[PDB]
Amino acid sequence: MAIIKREWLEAATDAHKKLGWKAKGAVVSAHDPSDTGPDAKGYASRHGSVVKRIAEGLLMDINEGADWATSLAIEDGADHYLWDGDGVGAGLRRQTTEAFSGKKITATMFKGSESPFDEDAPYQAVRTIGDVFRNKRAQFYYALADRLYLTYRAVVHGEYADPDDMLSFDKEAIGEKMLEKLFAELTQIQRKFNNNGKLELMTAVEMKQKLGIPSPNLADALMMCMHCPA
Ligand SMILES: [Mg+2]
Ligand SMILES: [Mg+2]
Protein backbone atom coordinates (compact mmCIF):
# COMPACT_ATOMS: atom_id res chain seq x y z
CA MET A 1 0.00 0.00 0.00
CA ALA A 2 3.03 2.32 0.15
CA ILE A 3 2.95 4.95 -2.60
CA ILE A 4 6.69 5.74 -2.94
CA LYS A 5 9.50 3.25 -3.62
CA ARG A 6 12.88 3.71 -2.01
CA GLU A 7 14.55 3.02 -5.35
CA TRP A 8 12.82 6.07 -6.83
CA LEU A 9 14.23 8.22 -4.01
CA GLU A 10 17.74 6.90 -4.56
CA ALA A 11 17.42 7.59 -8.33
CA ALA A 12 16.08 11.07 -7.61
CA THR A 13 19.06 11.89 -5.42
CA ASP A 14 21.13 14.31 -7.52
CA ALA A 15 19.02 13.43 -10.56
CA HIS A 16 19.55 16.94 -11.92
CA LYS A 17 23.30 16.30 -11.86
CA LYS A 18 22.96 12.81 -13.32
CA LEU A 19 20.78 14.02 -16.17
CA GLY A 20 22.34 17.44 -16.73
CA TRP A 21 19.74 20.04 -15.83
CA LYS A 22 19.49 22.99 -13.44
CA ALA A 23 16.78 24.27 -11.10
CA LYS A 24 14.39 26.71 -12.80
CA GLY A 25 11.18 28.16 -11.43
CA ALA A 26 9.81 29.61 -8.23
CA VAL A 27 11.14 28.82 -4.80
CA VAL A 28 8.44 27.03 -2.80
CA SER A 29 8.73 26.31 0.92
CA ALA A 30 6.35 24.57 3.29
CA HIS A 31 6.01 23.92 7.00
CA ASP A 32 4.44 21.14 9.00
CA PRO A 33 3.84 22.47 12.52
CA SER A 34 3.49 18.93 13.92
CA ASP A 35 0.37 17.20 15.15
CA THR A 36 0.18 18.45 18.71
CA GLY A 37 1.97 21.75 19.31
CA PRO A 38 5.36 20.94 20.83
CA ASP A 39 6.63 17.86 18.95
CA ALA A 40 8.97 17.60 15.94
CA LYS A 41 8.23 19.93 13.05
CA GLY A 42 9.05 19.88 9.35
CA TYR A 43 10.23 22.26 6.66
CA ALA A 44 11.00 21.69 3.00
CA SER A 45 12.01 23.97 0.17
CA ARG A 46 12.57 23.56 -3.55
CA HIS A 47 13.69 25.73 -6.42
CA GLY A 48 11.60 24.45 -9.29
CA SER A 49 12.14 20.72 -9.50
CA VAL A 50 15.24 20.65 -7.24
CA VAL A 51 14.72 20.15 -3.48
CA LYS A 52 17.32 22.23 -1.60
CA ARG A 53 16.40 22.07 2.12
CA ILE A 54 14.82 19.54 4.45
CA ALA A 55 14.81 20.63 8.07
CA GLU A 56 13.46 19.42 11.39
CA GLY A 57 12.29 21.82 14.09
CA LEU A 58 12.86 20.48 17.57
CA LEU A 59 11.75 21.51 21.07
CA MET A 60 9.62 24.39 19.87
CA ASP A 61 6.09 25.46 20.62
CA ILE A 62 3.79 26.24 17.73
CA ASN A 63 4.75 29.90 17.52
CA GLU A 64 8.49 29.28 17.79
CA GLY A 65 8.02 26.69 15.08
CA ALA A 66 6.37 29.16 12.72
CA ASP A 67 9.10 31.73 13.44
CA TRP A 68 11.67 29.07 12.60
CA ALA A 69 9.99 28.00 9.37
CA THR A 70 9.23 31.48 8.09
CA SER A 71 12.80 32.53 8.82
CA LEU A 72 13.99 29.53 6.76
CA ALA A 73 11.66 30.58 3.95
CA ILE A 74 13.21 34.03 4.01
CA GLU A 75 16.74 32.54 4.06
CA ASP A 76 15.80 30.32 1.11
CA GLY A 77 14.44 33.21 -0.97
CA ALA A 78 10.98 31.68 -1.10
CA ASP A 79 8.39 33.09 -3.47
CA HIS A 80 5.65 30.99 -1.87
CA TYR A 81 5.25 29.53 1.61
CA LEU A 82 2.64 27.00 2.69
CA TRP A 83 1.85 25.50 6.05
CA ASP A 84 -0.51 22.86 7.38
CA GLY A 85 -3.52 24.58 8.87
CA ASP A 86 -5.78 21.54 9.17
CA GLY A 87 -4.89 21.11 12.83
CA VAL A 88 -2.88 22.90 15.49
CA GLY A 89 -1.58 25.31 12.83
CA ALA A 90 -5.01 26.71 11.92
CA GLY A 91 -4.31 29.98 13.74
CA LEU A 92 -0.87 30.82 12.33
CA ARG A 93 -1.81 33.17 9.48
CA ARG A 94 -1.34 36.44 11.39
CA GLN A 95 2.12 35.44 12.64
CA THR A 96 3.05 34.13 9.23
CA THR A 97 2.02 37.28 7.38
CA GLU A 98 3.81 39.41 10.02
CA ALA A 99 6.96 37.42 9.41
CA PHE A 100 6.84 38.15 5.68
CA SER A 101 5.85 41.84 6.04
CA GLY A 102 7.71 43.90 3.43
CA LYS A 103 8.77 40.85 1.45
CA LYS A 104 7.44 39.34 -1.74
CA ILE A 105 6.46 35.98 -0.22
CA THR A 106 2.96 34.60 -0.49
CA ALA A 107 1.50 32.66 2.43
CA THR A 108 -1.00 29.86 1.78
CA MET A 109 -2.73 27.70 4.36
CA PHE A 110 -2.78 24.09 3.23
CA LYS A 111 -5.66 21.89 4.37
CA GLY A 112 -5.12 18.32 3.29
CA SER A 113 -8.72 17.36 4.05
CA GLU A 114 -10.14 19.75 1.44
CA SER A 115 -11.37 18.49 -1.91
CA PRO A 116 -8.62 18.54 -4.52
CA PHE A 117 -7.32 21.66 -6.16
CA ASP A 118 -8.92 22.15 -9.59
CA GLU A 119 -11.19 19.16 -9.00
CA ASP A 120 -13.38 19.62 -12.08
CA ALA A 121 -10.44 19.55 -14.49
CA PRO A 122 -9.69 16.36 -16.48
CA TYR A 123 -7.34 13.92 -14.83
CA GLN A 124 -4.00 13.75 -16.69
CA ALA A 125 -1.38 10.98 -16.94
CA VAL A 126 -14.78 12.15 -18.51
CA ARG A 127 -12.72 11.45 -15.38
CA THR A 128 -11.79 14.52 -13.30
CA ILE A 129 -9.18 15.25 -10.67
CA GLY A 130 -11.96 15.05 -8.07
CA ASP A 131 -12.99 11.59 -9.28
CA VAL A 132 -9.42 10.34 -8.78
CA PHE A 133 -8.25 11.93 -5.50
CA ARG A 134 -10.29 12.16 -2.32
CA ASN A 135 -8.56 15.28 -1.07
CA LYS A 136 -5.53 17.55 -1.31
CA ARG A 137 -3.39 15.34 0.91
CA ALA A 138 -3.80 12.51 -1.62
CA GLN A 139 -3.55 14.80 -4.63
CA PHE A 140 -0.24 16.32 -3.62
CA TYR A 141 1.36 13.16 -2.24
CA TYR A 142 0.60 11.57 -5.64
CA ALA A 143 2.00 14.67 -7.38
CA LEU A 144 5.17 13.91 -5.45
CA ALA A 145 5.01 10.19 -6.22
CA ASP A 146 4.45 10.85 -9.93
CA ARG A 147 7.42 13.24 -10.09
CA LEU A 148 9.62 10.69 -8.34
CA TYR A 149 8.55 7.78 -10.56
CA LEU A 150 9.12 9.77 -13.76
CA THR A 151 12.57 10.73 -12.37
CA TYR A 152 13.34 7.09 -11.67
CA ARG A 153 12.37 6.09 -15.21
CA ALA A 154 14.57 8.84 -16.65
CA VAL A 155 17.59 8.13 -14.44
CA VAL A 156 17.45 4.32 -14.38
CA HIS A 157 15.65 3.44 -17.64
CA GLY A 158 16.79 6.32 -19.85
CA GLU A 159 13.20 7.42 -20.56
CA TYR A 160 13.01 11.10 -21.33
CA ALA A 161 10.95 13.35 -19.13
CA ASP A 162 10.65 17.09 -18.87
CA PRO A 163 12.62 18.26 -15.78
CA ASP A 164 9.54 20.29 -14.89
CA ASP A 165 7.72 17.01 -14.25
CA MET A 166 10.60 15.45 -12.24
CA LEU A 167 12.01 15.99 -8.74
CA SER A 168 15.68 15.97 -7.76
CA PHE A 169 17.12 15.97 -4.26
CA ASP A 170 20.21 18.19 -4.02
CA LYS A 171 22.09 15.93 -1.64
CA GLU A 172 24.94 18.36 -0.95
CA ALA A 173 22.52 21.18 -0.14
CA ILE A 174 20.12 19.11 1.92
CA GLY A 175 22.67 16.99 3.76
CA GLU A 176 22.83 13.21 3.87
CA LYS A 177 21.40 12.83 7.39
CA MET A 178 18.25 14.85 6.75
CA LEU A 179 17.79 13.31 3.31
CA GLU A 180 17.83 9.81 4.86
CA LYS A 181 15.29 10.89 7.51
CA LEU A 182 13.01 12.23 4.77
CA PHE A 183 13.33 9.03 2.77
CA ALA A 184 12.49 6.86 5.78
CA GLU A 185 9.29 8.87 6.20
CA LEU A 186 8.34 8.94 2.53
CA THR A 187 8.38 5.15 2.22
CA GLN A 188 5.86 4.91 5.07
CA ILE A 189 3.14 6.98 3.35
CA GLN A 190 0.36 4.51 2.53
CA ARG A 191 -2.86 4.24 0.61
CA LYS A 192 -6.02 3.21 2.48
CA PHE A 193 -9.31 1.65 1.39
CA ASN A 194 -11.82 4.15 0.05
CA ASN A 195 -15.54 3.40 -0.33
CA ASN A 196 -15.97 5.71 -3.34
CA GLY A 197 -13.06 4.33 -5.33
CA LYS A 198 -10.88 7.38 -4.82
CA LEU A 199 -7.20 7.54 -3.91
CA GLU A 200 -6.89 8.28 -0.21
CA LEU A 201 -3.94 8.02 2.20
CA MET A 202 -3.70 6.96 5.82
CA THR A 203 -3.70 9.92 8.18
CA ALA A 204 -0.88 10.47 10.66
CA VAL A 205 -3.20 9.36 13.47
CA GLU A 206 -3.92 6.12 11.66
CA MET A 207 -0.24 5.55 10.87
CA LYS A 208 0.54 5.98 14.56
CA GLN A 209 -2.21 3.84 16.04
CA LYS A 210 -2.27 1.08 13.42
CA LEU A 211 1.42 0.75 12.55
CA GLY A 212 3.24 2.58 15.33
CA ILE A 213 4.93 5.04 12.97
CA PRO A 214 5.61 8.61 14.14
CA SER A 215 4.15 11.62 12.37
CA PRO A 216 5.91 12.08 9.02
CA ASN A 217 6.44 15.82 9.25
CA LEU A 218 9.34 16.03 6.80
CA ALA A 219 7.37 14.04 4.20
CA ASP A 220 4.31 16.23 4.75
CA ALA A 221 6.36 19.42 4.40
CA LEU A 222 7.76 18.18 1.08
CA MET A 223 4.30 17.11 -0.10
CA MET A 224 2.85 20.56 0.58
CA CYS A 225 5.62 22.11 -1.49
CA MET A 226 4.19 20.33 -4.52
CA HIS A 227 1.41 22.85 -4.62
CA CYS A 228 2.55 26.13 -6.13
CA PRO A 229 -0.32 28.53 -5.19
CA ALA A 230 -0.20 31.14 -8.01
MG1 LIG B 1 0.38 18.23 9.73
MG1 LIG C 1 1.93 16.43 9.31
PDB file of N, CA and C in Angstrom, residues 12 15-16 19-25 46-50 125 143-155 158-168:
ATOM      1  N   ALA A  12      16.339   9.641  -7.624  1.00  0.00           N
ATOM      2  CA  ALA A  12      16.076  11.065  -7.609  1.00  0.00           C
ATOM      3  C   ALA A  12      17.138  11.872  -6.894  1.00  0.00           C
ATOM      4  N   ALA A  15      19.458  13.716  -9.207  1.00  0.00           N
ATOM      5  CA  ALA A  15      19.015  13.425 -10.564  1.00  0.00           C
ATOM      6  C   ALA A  15      19.346  14.565 -11.521  1.00  0.00           C
ATOM      7  N   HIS A  16      19.235  15.805 -11.051  1.00  0.00           N
ATOM      8  CA  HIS A  16      19.545  16.939 -11.916  1.00  0.00           C
ATOM      9  C   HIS A  16      21.016  16.934 -12.356  1.00  0.00           C
ATOM     10  N   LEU A  19      21.436  13.835 -14.891  1.00  0.00           N
ATOM     11  CA  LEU A  19      20.783  14.023 -16.174  1.00  0.00           C
ATOM     12  C   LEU A  19      21.140  15.346 -16.843  1.00  0.00           C
ATOM     13  N   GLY A  20      21.830  16.224 -16.128  1.00  0.00           N
ATOM     14  CA  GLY A  20      22.339  17.440 -16.730  1.00  0.00           C
ATOM     15  C   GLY A  20      21.331  18.570 -16.876  1.00  0.00           C
ATOM     16  N   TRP A  21      20.571  18.840 -15.829  1.00  0.00           N
ATOM     17  CA  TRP A  21      19.741  20.044 -15.832  1.00  0.00           C
ATOM     18  C   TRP A  21      19.841  20.804 -14.522  1.00  0.00           C
ATOM     19  N   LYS A  22      19.342  22.039 -14.542  1.00  0.00           N
ATOM     20  CA  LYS A  22      19.490  22.990 -13.442  1.00  0.00           C
ATOM     21  C   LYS A  22      18.109  23.398 -12.946  1.00  0.00           C
ATOM     22  N   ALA A  23      18.025  23.778 -11.677  1.00  0.00           N
ATOM     23  CA  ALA A  23      16.779  24.269 -11.096  1.00  0.00           C
ATOM     24  C   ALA A  23      16.311  25.536 -11.803  1.00  0.00           C
ATOM     25  N   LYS A  24      15.041  25.538 -12.205  1.00  0.00           N
ATOM     26  CA  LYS A  24      14.392  26.707 -12.803  1.00  0.00           C
ATOM     27  C   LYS A  24      12.957  26.771 -12.296  1.00  0.00           C
ATOM     28  N   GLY A  25      12.553  27.944 -11.841  1.00  0.00           N
ATOM     29  CA  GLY A  25      11.181  28.160 -11.425  1.00  0.00           C
ATOM     30  C   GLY A  25      11.137  28.916 -10.120  1.00  0.00           C
ATOM     31  N   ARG A  46      12.034  23.897  -2.238  1.00  0.00           N
ATOM     32  CA  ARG A  46      12.575  23.561  -3.545  1.00  0.00           C
ATOM     33  C   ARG A  46      12.668  24.791  -4.413  1.00  0.00           C
ATOM     34  N   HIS A  47      13.583  24.749  -5.362  1.00  0.00           N
ATOM     35  CA  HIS A  47      13.693  25.730  -6.416  1.00  0.00           C
ATOM     36  C   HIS A  47      13.288  24.972  -7.661  1.00  0.00           C
ATOM     37  N   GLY A  48      12.117  25.273  -8.219  1.00  0.00           N
ATOM     38  CA  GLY A  48      11.604  24.452  -9.293  1.00  0.00           C
ATOM     39  C   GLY A  48      11.577  22.995  -8.886  1.00  0.00           C
ATOM     40  N   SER A  49      12.169  22.147  -9.727  1.00  0.00           N
ATOM     41  CA  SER A  49      12.137  20.722  -9.500  1.00  0.00           C
ATOM     42  C   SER A  49      13.318  20.203  -8.672  1.00  0.00           C
ATOM     43  N   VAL A  50      14.087  21.090  -8.052  1.00  0.00           N
ATOM     44  CA  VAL A  50      15.235  20.651  -7.239  1.00  0.00           C
ATOM     45  C   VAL A  50      14.993  20.998  -5.778  1.00  0.00           C
ATOM     46  N   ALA A 125      -2.367  12.027 -17.213  1.00  0.00           N
ATOM     47  CA  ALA A 125      -1.383  10.977 -16.944  1.00  0.00           C
ATOM     48  C   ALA A 125      -1.947   9.950 -15.971  1.00  0.00           C
ATOM     49  N   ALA A 143       1.214  13.782  -6.540  1.00  0.00           N
ATOM     50  CA  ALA A 143       2.002  14.669  -7.381  1.00  0.00           C
ATOM     51  C   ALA A 143       3.475  14.379  -7.121  1.00  0.00           C
ATOM     52  N   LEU A 144       3.801  14.224  -5.857  1.00  0.00           N
ATOM     53  CA  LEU A 144       5.172  13.908  -5.455  1.00  0.00           C
ATOM     54  C   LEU A 144       5.566  12.531  -6.005  1.00  0.00           C
ATOM     55  N   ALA A 145       4.710  11.535  -5.778  1.00  0.00           N
ATOM     56  CA  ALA A 145       5.009  10.190  -6.218  1.00  0.00           C
ATOM     57  C   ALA A 145       5.186  10.131  -7.731  1.00  0.00           C
ATOM     58  N   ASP A 146       4.333  10.821  -8.479  1.00  0.00           N
ATOM     59  CA  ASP A 146       4.447  10.849  -9.932  1.00  0.00           C
ATOM     60  C   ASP A 146       5.757  11.498 -10.380  1.00  0.00           C
ATOM     61  N   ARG A 147       6.139  12.613  -9.767  1.00  0.00           N
ATOM     62  CA  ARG A 147       7.420  13.242 -10.091  1.00  0.00           C
ATOM     63  C   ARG A 147       8.563  12.272  -9.844  1.00  0.00           C
ATOM     64  N   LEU A 148       8.535  11.609  -8.699  1.00  0.00           N
ATOM     65  CA  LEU A 148       9.615  10.686  -8.344  1.00  0.00           C
ATOM     66  C   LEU A 148       9.705   9.492  -9.296  1.00  0.00           C
ATOM     67  N   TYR A 149       8.563   8.917  -9.647  1.00  0.00           N
ATOM     68  CA  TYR A 149       8.554   7.785 -10.564  1.00  0.00           C
ATOM     69  C   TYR A 149       9.081   8.174 -11.942  1.00  0.00           C
ATOM     70  N   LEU A 150       8.636   9.306 -12.463  1.00  0.00           N
ATOM     71  CA  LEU A 150       9.118   9.769 -13.756  1.00  0.00           C
ATOM     72  C   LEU A 150      10.650   9.998 -13.698  1.00  0.00           C
ATOM     73  N   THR A 151      11.133  10.501 -12.566  1.00  0.00           N
ATOM     74  CA  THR A 151      12.571  10.733 -12.371  1.00  0.00           C
ATOM     75  C   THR A 151      13.323   9.419 -12.364  1.00  0.00           C
ATOM     76  N   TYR A 152      12.773   8.436 -11.663  1.00  0.00           N
ATOM     77  CA  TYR A 152      13.341   7.091 -11.666  1.00  0.00           C
ATOM     78  C   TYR A 152      13.431   6.518 -13.078  1.00  0.00           C
ATOM     79  N   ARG A 153      12.361   6.635 -13.854  1.00  0.00           N
ATOM     80  CA  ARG A 153      12.371   6.094 -15.208  1.00  0.00           C
ATOM     81  C   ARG A 153      13.403   6.815 -16.087  1.00  0.00           C
ATOM     82  N   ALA A 154      13.590   8.109 -15.866  1.00  0.00           N
ATOM     83  CA  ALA A 154      14.570   8.843 -16.648  1.00  0.00           C
ATOM     84  C   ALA A 154      16.003   8.462 -16.265  1.00  0.00           C
ATOM     85  N   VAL A 155      16.249   8.369 -14.970  1.00  0.00           N
ATOM     86  CA  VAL A 155      17.587   8.129 -14.439  1.00  0.00           C
ATOM     87  C   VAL A 155      18.015   6.676 -14.666  1.00  0.00           C
ATOM     88  N   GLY A 158      16.470   5.473 -18.719  1.00  0.00           N
ATOM     89  CA  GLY A 158      16.788   6.324 -19.855  1.00  0.00           C
ATOM     90  C   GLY A 158      15.578   6.844 -20.620  1.00  0.00           C
ATOM     91  N   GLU A 159      14.426   6.909 -19.952  1.00  0.00           N
ATOM     92  CA  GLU A 159      13.196   7.417 -20.561  1.00  0.00           C
ATOM     93  C   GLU A 159      13.038   8.914 -20.339  1.00  0.00           C
ATOM     94  N   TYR A 160      13.047   9.654 -21.436  1.00  0.00           N
ATOM     95  CA  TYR A 160      13.014  11.099 -21.333  1.00  0.00           C
ATOM     96  C   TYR A 160      11.793  11.593 -20.571  1.00  0.00           C
ATOM     97  N   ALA A 161      12.024  12.626 -19.778  1.00  0.00           N
ATOM     98  CA  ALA A 161      10.951  13.348 -19.133  1.00  0.00           C
ATOM     99  C   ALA A 161      11.370  14.797 -19.043  1.00  0.00           C
ATOM    100  N   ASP A 162      10.385  15.677 -19.058  1.00  0.00           N
ATOM    101  CA  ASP A 162      10.649  17.094 -18.871  1.00  0.00           C
ATOM    102  C   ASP A 162      11.074  17.305 -17.399  1.00  0.00           C
ATOM    103  N   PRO A 163      12.200  18.000 -17.167  1.00  0.00           N
ATOM    104  CA  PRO A 163      12.620  18.264 -15.781  1.00  0.00           C
ATOM    105  C   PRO A 163      11.527  18.906 -14.946  1.00  0.00           C
ATOM    106  N   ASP A 164      10.647  19.652 -15.603  1.00  0.00           N
ATOM    107  CA  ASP A 164       9.544  20.288 -14.888  1.00  0.00           C
ATOM    108  C   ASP A 164       8.564  19.296 -14.253  1.00  0.00           C
ATOM    109  N   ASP A 165       8.571  18.069 -14.748  1.00  0.00           N
ATOM    110  CA  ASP A 165       7.717  17.006 -14.249  1.00  0.00           C
ATOM    111  C   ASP A 165       8.487  16.029 -13.319  1.00  0.00           C
ATOM    112  N   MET A 166       9.756  16.311 -13.079  1.00  0.00           N
ATOM    113  CA  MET A 166      10.602  15.447 -12.241  1.00  0.00           C
ATOM    114  C   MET A 166      10.818  16.076 -10.864  1.00  0.00           C
ATOM    115  N   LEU A 167      11.612  15.422 -10.013  1.00  0.00           N
ATOM    116  CA  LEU A 167      12.009  15.991  -8.735  1.00  0.00           C
ATOM    117  C   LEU A 167      13.377  15.427  -8.402  1.00  0.00           C
ATOM    118  N   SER A 168      14.326  16.316  -8.161  1.00  0.00           N
ATOM    119  CA  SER A 168      15.678  15.972  -7.758  1.00  0.00           C
ATOM    120  C   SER A 168      15.935  16.393  -6.329  1.00  0.00           C
TER     121      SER A 168
END
